[PDB]
Design an enzyme around this catalytic site. Structure first.
Site, PDB file in Angstrom:
ATOM      1  N   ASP A   1       0.807  -1.230   0.000  1.00 28.89           N
ATOM      2  CA  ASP A   1       0.000   0.000   0.000  1.00 28.89           C
ATOM      3  C   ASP A   1       0.834   1.271   0.000  1.00 28.89           C
ATOM      4  O   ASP A   1       0.561   2.208   0.753  1.00 28.89           O
ATOM      5  CB  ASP A   1      -0.957   0.054   1.192  1.00 28.89           C
ATOM      6  CG  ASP A   1      -2.011  -1.044   1.157  1.00 28.89           C
ATOM      7  OD1 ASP A   1      -2.893  -1.023   0.272  1.00 28.89           O
ATOM      8  OD2 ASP A   1      -1.953  -1.928   2.029  1.00 28.89           O
TER       9      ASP A   1
HETATM   10  O1  LIG Z   1      -0.818  -7.763   5.431  1.00 27.87           O
HETATM   11  C1  LIG Z   1      -1.985  -7.293   5.392  1.00 27.87           C
HETATM   12  C2  LIG Z   1      -2.358  -5.894   5.472  1.00 27.87           C
HETATM   13  C3  LIG Z   1      -3.671  -5.534   5.406  1.00 27.87           C
HETATM   14  N1  LIG Z   1      -4.706  -6.450   5.240  1.00 27.87           N
HETATM   15  C4  LIG Z   1      -6.184  -6.040   5.144  1.00 27.87           C
HETATM   16  O2  LIG Z   1      -6.333  -4.718   4.748  1.00 27.87           O
HETATM   17  C5  LIG Z   1      -7.746  -4.413   4.954  1.00 27.87           C
HETATM   18  C6  LIG Z   1      -7.943  -2.947   5.189  1.00 27.87           C
HETATM   19  O3  LIG Z   1      -7.159  -2.227   4.273  1.00 27.87           O
HETATM   20  P1  LIG Z   1      -6.877  -0.697   4.536  1.00 27.87           P
HETATM   21  O4  LIG Z   1      -6.039  -0.113   3.451  1.00 27.87           O
HETATM   22  O5  LIG Z   1      -8.162  -0.001   4.955  1.00 27.87           O
HETATM   23  O6  LIG Z   1      -5.996  -0.937   5.894  1.00 27.87           O
HETATM   24  P2  LIG Z   1      -4.759  -0.176   6.518  1.00 27.87           P
HETATM   25  O7  LIG Z   1      -3.897  -1.265   6.985  1.00 27.87           O
HETATM   26  O8  LIG Z   1      -4.148   0.837   5.679  1.00 27.87           O
HETATM   27  O9  LIG Z   1      -5.549   0.575   7.670  1.00 27.87           O
HETATM   28  P3  LIG Z   1      -5.067   1.590   8.799  1.00 27.87           P
HETATM   29  O10 LIG Z   1      -3.543   1.687   8.638  1.00 27.87           O
HETATM   30  O11 LIG Z   1      -5.771   2.942   8.528  1.00 27.87           O
HETATM   31  O12 LIG Z   1      -5.530   0.971  10.154  1.00 27.87           O
HETATM   32  C7  LIG Z   1      -8.228  -5.268   6.111  1.00 27.87           C
HETATM   33  O13 LIG Z   1      -9.292  -6.132   5.644  1.00 27.87           O
HETATM   34  C8  LIG Z   1      -6.926  -6.019   6.494  1.00 27.87           C
HETATM   35  O14 LIG Z   1      -7.086  -7.296   7.081  1.00 27.87           O
HETATM   36  C9  LIG Z   1      -4.411  -7.853   5.146  1.00 27.87           C
HETATM   37  O15 LIG Z   1      -5.300  -8.709   4.989  1.00 27.87           O
HETATM   38  N2  LIG Z   1      -3.063  -8.174   5.221  1.00 27.87           N
HETATM   39 MN   LIG Z   2      -3.353  -1.001   4.096  1.00 24.90          MN
END
Ligand SMILES: O=c1ccn([C@@H]2O[C@H](COP(=O)(O)OP(=O)(O)OP(=O)(O)O)[C@@H](O)[C@H]2O)c(=O)[nH]1
Ligand SMILES: [Mn+2]
Ligand SMILES: [Mn+2]
Ligand SMILES: [Zn+2]
Ligand SMILES: [Zn+2]
Ligand SMILES: [Zn+2]
Lengths: 773, 188, 133, 146, 114, 263, 84, 36, 164, 65
Positions: D116
């Site tokens: 991301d």
């Molecule tokens: O390694 C990872 C990272 C993230 N995700 C998945 O990303 C999804 C949410 O994706 P987001 O983009 O909303 O999460 P984020 O981690 O950026 O959120 P914050 O920093 O604001 O708290 C959720 O459904 C989560 O389980 C995974 O499945 N695996």
């Molecule tokens: Mn994320």
């Protein structure tokens, strides 16, 4: 109490994180500005008098500098405000508060920290631009990504404190974690996607690039490997170059579905002496998998070599991926026109079944199962028909996608995506639900004002026929938003509830520690376990190994272990051993060989009592299979010659070794018995792996190889024992809490609500069941 | 104050997926298309499967077409616009219908074995940036060490660190105590 | 300086199996009917078809780095067209009364099934592969 | 004989209609009303967008140079999204946008955009891509009942 | 604030040289030259040329980290053949090759009507 | 003349569609990069704002000014300000311009780049002249004024390169292609039903021989013959961008032989 | 309450903890200009030196492992088998 | 009461002004104090 | 349910068996019903298993329950961590909860973490009861300015006088 | 605010074609696409640059202070 909440935070900075493929696994990118604020009090000695002097001259504004110089008497000299900042003569014993510099041990943390692996020590790597940087494979333990996340960096302040971090907390020393006796760090995203493409047979590379790739690996010995092709063009293989990254002395056998020694599908994995023989490299092999490449290197070569392996693999693949390229687009979500006609019909077929059950129910011909409502059986059938439909329609979409399809590619490599994803994007989305049922009649006898009363059809109660590619209808949209909302809410709860449980678990088990007598006790000194984990072993030294003795028919058991020197048809053929021909009819040895057999047969009984299920694969210390494969490689054993091992060699040797695998050393009766119990299982494993016939007929070990194997098992066994001082309690709580946080989702209370119902010892359970055989 | 995009600043499309700038590359180094076109952003493909944000891939296709045709791209929900319908128009413009394009690596000039999904996409710059959250609290003479950070170090077994990080600045006063009564009634 | 195997083969099947550059050939043997061969081949650098005739030799010579030119003009110890080189993870199956060995060429697998190779095939890495016409 | 590309719909089994929707997209509010092709997104991601949009930079008003408010972010070169919505018209989005149509590539490149994160063209940043103004105003007085 | 100045991308800072030559240990007749204030433009260029030389056993280049403007060039050659000479032969071969192109261009540019 | 081979297809004051032949991809690509980031040019790099009642902020206007293409014909006869032995700037290393505009009329007053005035001595060298290409002789629209609004600036042009900032870049876009027919197979085409049918055929496919069905993969054919097309931004003649690019790269390669010398 | 050098049931091996604290204490003394017992073949970093002293078994320290009942065993660093 | 948000609460808030649509959104917000 | 059993030849084979799942629990009585196998009866209510089959049986059920809750998400946790928790919950012959049962502590010390805005009240009771603090906790040792007898501090280091 | 001087992606001068684009629309009554193409803007990166601009300065100019 303020210092019991981290109010007085001194010597620590926090900022946004970013991934960086050009940093080593144990490093952390610390921006110059932040390194200018944090300091370490270093004593002036002839070992540093010089460097320290340079720093002080660089002052607080240039990086390799310092902020203060404390004199013997304890006087502080502010290097920014001092008529003598650039006129100081450091004296032995003085202190210089210098800026953090490359390779200083620093604690790094991503909250919430419900995992010891959320706080690992990292070597400092000062770099330009703001934001802390990390190697992509440290991402999983910290449970972070790079879309705004912020972590904390803490600078130890003493010499003892510095050693404690690097000798216990250092990132490399955490790779293989006790939480699940397996690695918790592995290759992810690009590298994972890129490594699979690289390993495909069709993947070849020309000299020009092979040289660059080779050079990208810093531990390369300058020896250009010979091409897998020399003919009209010296061509290399992806696998070939990848192996430069894998160190010598590594072996990894893994058989998949139809994987054969000639795996046509390029299935399984086989790495001999640090060279991949066959199989596409992916999550199963390079991921955080149990017995994968990473687990092996860690144990075989140690934590530092393993750490370096993350960086080597990443450089070769990231480089290879940067010139190959990978992408994804709408195209990757489109299924064949004919496949779409097969999908639409599959769904129409399901809507016919539902229509027949409805007529059946409206006629009152349908009968409900025992202890079940007429309407319950009805709903139960419609939902099964519909999910069945979505699922089968999903497979049709997947089968159609080619090996070129990027979505399908990410799934094959194990880097993001899964079936349900392809199925919903390309084919049918599926049945929406709220509280385990189809969308409810919120208006009177109807789900929406757009439908007629008493409509129990699939479109009426939330079946989304369309895919994401096709787009949802306004009704499918609203229904899906109702399903979705439930998820956002449950996630908030699952998040709020688990956080509390995690703190109650820690608090209750926080003072439980392993003492020097191998006993597990609490602060009062009460015994909780007479020996830790009833085996006195460290979980990070435990590997899933199969106990052969337990399974199979009795004939197979006897054909494998029984040795009868007194029988021309069941003795050891003279080709398996030199003393082969003169062993025949040897009364005295046979007596020894019957002792070994009776013991194995005893074990078979014993194991079948412990594992009533018949399950043979169980986690244990000292991976015997590996030690054996290694021996063969190390001594270049040739299956074409009879061994020089005496029978007394094997039997007596295997017997003697069991007497040295120590957990408890007390000289009294009680302990010696407790010591026999705690090693009973491993010992049953041992005997099944070092049974004379197995040693001579299967392994073909020599007296030398064999002798080596024994001392190894001993060194590893003792090495797998738990260390007194382990805060096993806290470890246990966090091992149950961290994963319990990952519980975001037949009719029995489970998930967090059940766990919270278990840990509360509630007298009134929600679903009091009773199973009667 | 003017704020120029840097490393760590947030950005996101209108499909529920943010991301900070991991790094910046000059046009030369960026991958390029036959027409000499270069990307202003580069998002990762692994951010597509799990989120299943098809709309984003469609916005792109529609946007490519709109920019070439000079017409506004209708992305309104519940209409008859289709990817197939959008592909035809894109194709009529000389490009491969599914938004893909051939690209060359900026370091070598050599092609990419894979074609890249390339097209314009609306992106929002979010507030709350790096320089507004960089806190380094290391006085000389989040960001906290709370109960959870303590449990962690406990599991690591790092008692020295625990004692160092939690020892109040207060003077380590020296007292005398009787071995019979654990009191500080000793006149020294 | 050596040579360990020599014979001619009758290609009976050339399968590309979802690949686009390599095919898995399985040709019969001339003279002796026992001898068989399953081998992966980079078709792009040496096409292959059914009922063809391939002269296959294993050899093991004519580990230091690697040099491209000069030697590829002088000591051209290649009187063939196809030339691979791999490591033997030889699993002498000792199937019934025959002996089948295994070679791995950068992932490209090979397997012979005979018995008159007892004092032929090595038990070590170094093992080239030559084929002509 | 329906277009194999359009979304499937259920045939009308009623001749009792009393009313008809002016337009189904009006079930949305101001935020979701700005998401392109929301009917092609997984439900929860539409929610995330309706939240993040409130953290975007645009031109909250055309008189920002006269208001003396606490904080303000004015995007240097606002662009109107190539992919709009019919609702956007009444939301005055094309008039006061909050973003730019960047040429976006979906690729694994140097690997500096994993998990991301994203790589942005530096050269573009020089020509003003995503630059923005940031205003902050302070307030102070004098004596009280002293 | 933490971002380095732009000129540092092509301007040598104090205490820096355009070339750093060191003897490679992993192999004989090998050298590792560190080009300061240069990127893929030169690295891949001199690299590609060093490869046309047959008496060159090894040639590769890599920029260890995109943050900094510098790359490493490793060269290996036959005994008697100095690696620093292959770099000279390569450089000259480039300069000549480019010079010819500059001429052929300023020529074809004349025969144009626009 | 042996070696690289130019073969121009089109040519004008803005673009140079040609065909490099008999060269290594690396060189072709290196030149492509040099044209984009290392060809010296003059561009506003300092702005003194005396009066600004306009609707735009200083840095906003400043930013745009620096983006205004300036005549860089004799850019080589202008020393880099960082080298020049003077204090700050002078005619030997910099061109100074002024911008004075007042909202006089009632209708919006447009402030173009033509309104820029050189105040330093050009010493007879074609340099510093704001580039204009619109059929109105106005050039780039810097700002706009309402009756009453004023803007008095002082810009200091300086020699620079794109590597330091895109504004100093003489090039615009640079088409680059080779092997229009995927004979080398440097790319693996994505498809649904037909690779060829789905992928648009390139312009250059005409300038080359389509592969022949039977012929087996030519594993020796390398990458030569690149179809380029440069586009000037105006600060420098199209042909110059190329030429000077070829020359600049040539200098770098030389700066290394000199390093070996003093080494 | 003291335990004879004989009858010691505790591990002959050093624990990761013991080693960590020993490398930490010893490094503190080295950083404070305390004398070193091993030939400094280049090393300057205190810990790096402490480690060299551990290997060559030249750290005159003793670990007093207490048992939960109050008693304790005395092991010399030299004596402890280091393999972690 | 209009300056605080107290009625008998958070009933009143500072108008959002981040982005135009964000302001619109706030003006059409809803709140529910305190079965599903 | 399919049941993994040893076939007469030795190898494990699946043998189907009818099983009854009930809504509601009355172990003590259902167990007594004829025709069933009292040896294999079970219930997700570990509490009833404890009162009817004893603490030891209870421990095993308490374990099986915790295990399922985690194995439910396909997750895995080494046995020793859940075994530890289950033992703590069972040491005193009963089923003690983990979710803050005692309004005071869990297994801490009075001088430990200054929980509650009033530690004084906890001090009074300690005085009136002659409470004895072992001083093995972190917080209690912090106030004393000492390192806790944990991990690295679970032993003492002394100068040696033997090394010549 | 106003027509960006160069196109973000390639740098092609575009900030000297706003008025022309406008006339090509009102006075010549040409369509957006046909208009941008007559301004030499062929690559979608440059096209979007003008087609997507929002000349907010006009409304800004409408203030007195
Ligand atoms: O390694 C990872 C990272 C993230 N995700 C998945 O990303 C999804 C949410 O994706 P987001 O983009 O909303 O999460 P984020 O981690 O950026 O959120 P914050 O920093 O604001 O708290 C959720 O459904 C989560 O389980 C995974 O499945 N695996
Ligand atoms: Mn994320
Ligand atoms: Mn995140
Ligand atoms: Zn007393
Ligand atoms: Zn000057
Ligand atoms: Zn453009």
């Amino acid at each position: 109490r303020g210092n019991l909440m981290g109010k007085r935070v001194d010597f620590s900075a926090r900022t946004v994180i970013s991934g960086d493929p050009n940093l080593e696994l144990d490093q952390v990118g610390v921006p110059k500005s932040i390194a200018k604020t944090l300091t370490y009090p270093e004593v002036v000695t002839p070992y540093n008098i010089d460097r320290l002097t340079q720093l002080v001259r660089n002052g607080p504004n240039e990086h390799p500098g310092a902020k203060y110089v404390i004199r013997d008497s304890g006087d502080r000299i502010d290097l920014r405000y001092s008529k003598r900042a650039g006129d100081i003569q450091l004296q032995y014993g003085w202190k210089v508060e210098r800026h953090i510099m490359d390779n200083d041990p620093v604690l790094f943390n991503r909250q919430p920290s419900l995992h010891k692996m959320s706080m690992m020590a990292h070597r400092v790597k000062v770099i330009p631009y703001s934001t802390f940087r990390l190697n992509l494979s440290v991402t999983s333990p910290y449970n972070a990504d790079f879309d705004g996340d912020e972590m904390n960096l803490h600078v130890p302040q003493s010499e003892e404190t510095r050693a404690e971090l690097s000798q216990l907390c250092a990132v490399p020393l955490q790779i293989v974690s006790p939480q699940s006796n397996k690695p918790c760090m592995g290759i992810v995203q690009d590298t994972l996607c890129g490594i699979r493409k690289l390993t495909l047979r069709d993947t070849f590379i020309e000299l020009d690039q092979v040289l660059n790739m080779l050079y990208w690996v810093p531990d390369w010995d300058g020896v250009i490997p010979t091409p897998a092709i020399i003919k009209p063009k010296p061509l290399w293989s992806g696998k070939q170059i990848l192996s430069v990254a894998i160190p010598n002395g590594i072996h990894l056998q893994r058989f998949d579905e139809g994987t054969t020694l000639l795996s046509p599908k390029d299935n399984g994995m086989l790495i001999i002496d640090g060279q991949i023989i066959f199989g596409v490299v992916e999550k199963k092999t390079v991921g955080s998998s149990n017995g994968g490449l990473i687990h092996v290197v860690t144990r075989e070569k140690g934590p530092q070599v393993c750490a370096k392996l993350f960086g080597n693999i990443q450089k070769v693949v990231n480089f290879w991926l940067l010139h190959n390229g990978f992408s994804t687009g709408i195209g990757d979500t489109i299924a064949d026109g004919p496949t779409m006609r097969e999908i639409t019909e599959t769904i129409a077929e399901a809507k016919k079944k539902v229509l027949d059950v409805t007529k059946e129910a409206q006629a009152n011909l349908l009968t409900a199962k025992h202890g079940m409502t007429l309407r319950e059986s009805f709903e139960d059938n419609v939902v099964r028909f519909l999910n069945e439909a979505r699922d089968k329609a999903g497979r049709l979409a997947e089968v159609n996608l080619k090996d070129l399809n990027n979505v399908k590619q990410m799934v094959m490599a194990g880097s993001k995506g899964s079936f349900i994803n392809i199925a919903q994007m390309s084919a049918c989305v599926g049945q929406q639900s709220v509280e385990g049922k189809r969308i409810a009649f919120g208006f009177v006898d109807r789900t929406l004002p757009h439908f007629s009363k008493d409509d129990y059809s699939p479109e009426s109660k939330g079946f989304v026929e369309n895919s994401y590619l096709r787009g949802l209808t306004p009704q499918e949209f609203f229904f899906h938003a109702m399903g979705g909302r439930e998820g956002l809410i449950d996630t908030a709860v699952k998040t709020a509830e688990t956080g509390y449980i995690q703190r109650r678990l820690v608090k209750a088990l926080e003072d439980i520690m392993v003492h020097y007598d191998n006993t597990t006790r609490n602060s009062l000194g009460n015994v909780i376990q007479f020996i830790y984990g009833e085996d006195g072993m460290d979980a990070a030294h435990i590997e899933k190994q199969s106990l052969d003795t337990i399974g199979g028919s009795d004939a197979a058991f006897e054909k494998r272990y029984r040795v009868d020197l007194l029988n021309t048809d069941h003795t050891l053929d003279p080709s398996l051993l030199e003393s082969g021909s003169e062993i025949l009819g040897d009364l005295k040895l046979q007596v020894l060989l019957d002792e070994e057999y009776k013991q194995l047969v005893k074990d078979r009984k014993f194991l079948r009592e412990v594992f009533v299920d018949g399950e043979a694969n169980w986690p244990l210390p000292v991976n015997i299979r590996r030690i054996i494969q290694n021996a063969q490689q190390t001594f270049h054993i040739d299956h074409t010659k009879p061994s020089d091992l005496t029978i007394k060699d094997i039997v007596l040797g295997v017997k003697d070794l069991q007497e040295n695998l120590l957990v408890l050393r007390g000289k009294n009766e009680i302990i010696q018995n407790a010591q026999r119990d705690a090693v009973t299982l491993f010992c049953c494993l041992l005997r099944s792996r070092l049974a004379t016939r197995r040693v001579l007929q299967e392994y073909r070990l020599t007296k030398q190889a064999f002798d080596w194997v024994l001392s190894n098992i001993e060194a590893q066994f003792l090495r797998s024992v738990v260390h007194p001082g382990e805060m096993v309690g806290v470890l246990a709580a966090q091992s149950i809490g961290e994963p319990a946080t990952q519980m975001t989702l037949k009719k029995v209370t489970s998930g967090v609500p059940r766990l919270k119902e278990i840990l509360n010892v509630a007298k009134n359970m929600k679903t009091p069941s009773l199973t009667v055989y | 104050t003017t704020k120029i995009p840097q490393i760590g600043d947030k950005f996101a499309s209108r499909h529920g997926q943010k991301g900070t700038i991991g790094i910046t590359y000059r046009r030369e180094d960026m991958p390029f298309t036959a027409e000499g076109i270069v990307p202003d952003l580069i998002i990762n493909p692994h951010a597509i499967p799990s989120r299943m944000t098809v709309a984003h891939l469609i916005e792109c296709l529609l946007s490519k077409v709109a920019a070439l045709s000079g017409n506004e791209g209708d992305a309104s929900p519940f209409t008859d616009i289709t990817v197939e319908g959008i592909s035809k128009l894109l194709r009529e413009h000389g490009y491969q219908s599914r938004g893909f394009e051939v690209m060359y690596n900026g370091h070598t000039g050599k092609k990419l074995m894979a074609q890249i999904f390339f097209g314009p996409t609306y992106y929002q710059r979010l507030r709350h940036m790096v320089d507004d959250k960089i806190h380094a609290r290391a006085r000389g003479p989040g960001l906290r060490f709370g109960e959870m950070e303590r449990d962690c170090m406990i599991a690591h077994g790092a008692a020295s660190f625990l004692k160092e990080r939690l020892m109040e600045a207060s003077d380590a006063f020296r007292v005398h105590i009787c071995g019979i009564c654990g009191l500080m009634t000793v006149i020294a | 300086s050596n040579t360990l195997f020599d014979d001619i083969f009758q290609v009976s099947e050339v399968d590309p199996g979802r690949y686009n550059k390599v095919c898995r050939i399985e040709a019969a043997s001339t003279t002796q009917d026992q001898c068989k061969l399953t081998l992966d081949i980079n078709v792009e650098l040496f096409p292959v078809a059914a009922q063809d005739s391939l002269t296959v030799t294993i050899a093991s010579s004519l580990t230091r780095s690697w040099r491209p030119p000069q030697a590829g003009d002088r000591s051209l110890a290649d009187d063939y067209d196809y030339v691979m080189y791999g490591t033997a993870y030889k699993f002498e199956e000792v199937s019934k009364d025959l002996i089948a060995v295994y070679y791995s060429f950068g992932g490209l697998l090979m397997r012979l099934e005979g018995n008159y190779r007892n004092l032929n095939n090595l038990k070590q890495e170094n093992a080239y592969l030559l084929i002509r016409r | 004989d329906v277009d194999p590309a359009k979304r499937i719909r259920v045939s009308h089994h009623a001749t009792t209609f009393t009313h008809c929707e002016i337009h189904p997209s009006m079930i949305l509010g101001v935020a979701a009303s700005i998401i392109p092709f929301p009917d092609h997104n997984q439900s929860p991601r539409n929610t995330y967008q309706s939240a993040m949009g409130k953290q975007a930079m645009g031109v909250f008003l055309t008189n920002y140079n006269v208001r003396m408010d606490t904080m303000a972010n004015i995007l240097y070169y606002p662009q109107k999204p190539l992919g709009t919505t019919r609702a956007m018209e009444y939301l005055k989005f094309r008039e006061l946008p909050a973003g730019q149509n960047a040429i976006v590539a979906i690729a694994c490149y140097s690997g500096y955009n994993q998990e991301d994160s994203m790589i942005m063209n530096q050269s573009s940043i020089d020509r003003g891509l995503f630059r923005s103004l940031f205003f902050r105003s302070y307030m102070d007085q004098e004596k009280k009942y002293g | 604030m933490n971002a380095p100045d732009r000129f540092e991308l092509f301007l040598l800072g104090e205490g820096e040289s355009k070339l750093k030559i060191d003897p490679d240990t992993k192999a004989p007749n090998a050298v590792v030259i560190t080009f300061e204030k240069e990127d893929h433009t030169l690295g891949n260029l001199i690299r590609a040329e060093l490869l046309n030389d047959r008496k060159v056993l090894f040639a590769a280049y890599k920029v260890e980290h995109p943050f900094f403007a510098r790359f490493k060039l490793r060269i290996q050659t036959t005994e008697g053949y100095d690696p620093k000479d292959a770099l000279k032969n390569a450089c000259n071969s480039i300069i000549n090759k480019l010079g010819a192109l500059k001429t052929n261009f300023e020529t074809e540019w004349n025969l144009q009507t626009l | 003349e042996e070696g690289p081979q130019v073969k121009i297809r089109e040519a004008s004051k803005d673009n140079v569609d040609f065909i490099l032949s008999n060269v290594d991809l690396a060189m072709a690509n290196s030149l492509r990069r040099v044209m984009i980031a290392e060809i010296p040019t003059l561009a506003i790099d300092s702005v003194e704002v005396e009066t600004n009642t306009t609707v735009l902020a200083d840095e906003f206007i400043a930013h745009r000014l620096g983006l205004i293409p300036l005549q860089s014909m004799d850019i080589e006869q202008l020393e880099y300000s960082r080298d020049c032995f003077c204090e700050d700037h002078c005619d030997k290393c910099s061109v100074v311009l002024t911008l004075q505009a007042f909202g006089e009329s009632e209708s919006t007053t447009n402030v173009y780049s033509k309104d820029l005035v050189i105040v330093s001595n050009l010493m007879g060298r074609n340099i510093g002249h704001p580039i204009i290409q619109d059929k109105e002789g106005n050039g780039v629209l810097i700002c706009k004024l309402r009756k009453g609004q004023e803007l008095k600036l002082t810009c200091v042009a300086k020699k620079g390169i794109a590597k330091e900032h895109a504004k100093w870049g003489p090039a615009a876009a640079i088409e680059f292609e080779y092997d229009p027919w995927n004979k080398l197979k440097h790319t693996d085409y994505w498809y649904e039903q037909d690779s060829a049918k789905e992928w648009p055929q390139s312009k250059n496919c005409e300038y080359e021989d389509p592969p022949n069905e039977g012929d087996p993969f030519d594993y020796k054919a390398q990458a030569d013959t690149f179809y380029m097309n440069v586009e000037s931004v105006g600060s420098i003649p199209v042909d110059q961008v190329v030429v000077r690019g070829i020359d600049t790269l040539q200098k770098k390669v030389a700066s290394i032989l000199l390093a070996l010398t003093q080494m | 309450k003291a335990i004879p050098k004989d009858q010691r049931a505790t591990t002959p091996y050093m624990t990761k903890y013991e080693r960590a604290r020993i490398l930490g204490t010893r490094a503190l003394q080295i950083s404070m200009n305390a004398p070193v017992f091993v030939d400094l073949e280049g090393e300057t970093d205190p810990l790096r030196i402490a480690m060299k002293e551990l290997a060559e078994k030249k750290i005159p320290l003793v670990i007093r492992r207490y048992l939960p009942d109050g008693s304790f065993e005395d092991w010399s660093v030299e004596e402890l088998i280091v393999d972690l | 009461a209009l300056a605080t948000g107290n009625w008998g609460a958070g009933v009143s808030q500072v108008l959002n002004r981040y982005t135009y649509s964000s302001t619109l959104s706030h003006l059409r917000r809803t709140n529910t104090p305190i079965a599903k | 349910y399919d049941r993994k059993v040893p076939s007469p030849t030795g190898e494990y084979v699946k043998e189907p068996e009818w099983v009854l799942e009930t809504d509601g629990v009355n172990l003590s009585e259902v167990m007594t019903v004829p025709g069933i196998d009292p040896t294999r009866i079970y219930t997700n209510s570990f509490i009833d298993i404890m009162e009817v089959l004893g603490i030891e049986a209870g421990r095993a059920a308490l374990y099986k329950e915790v295990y399922n809750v985690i194995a439910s998400d396909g997750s895995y946790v080494n046995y020793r961590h859940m075994a530890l928790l289950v033992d703590v919950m069972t040491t005193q012959g009963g089923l003690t909860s983990v979710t803050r049962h005692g309004f005071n502590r869990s297994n801490t010390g009075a001088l430990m973490r200054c929980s509650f805005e009033e530690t004084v009240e906890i001090l009074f009771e300690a005085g009136a009861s002659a409470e004895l603090d072992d001083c093995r906790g972190v917080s209690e040792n912090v106030i004393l300015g000492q390192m806790a007898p944990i991990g690295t501090g679970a032993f003492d280091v002394m100068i040696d006088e033997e090394s010549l | 605010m106003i027509v960006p001087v160069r196109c973000f992606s390639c740098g092609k001068v575009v900030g000297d074609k706003w008025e022309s684009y406008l006339n090509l629309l009102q006075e010549d009554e040409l369509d957006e696409g046909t208009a941008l193409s007559r301004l030499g803007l062929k690559r979608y990166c440059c096209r979007r640059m003008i087609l997507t601009h929002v000349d907010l300065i006009e409304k800004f100019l409408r203030y007195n202070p």
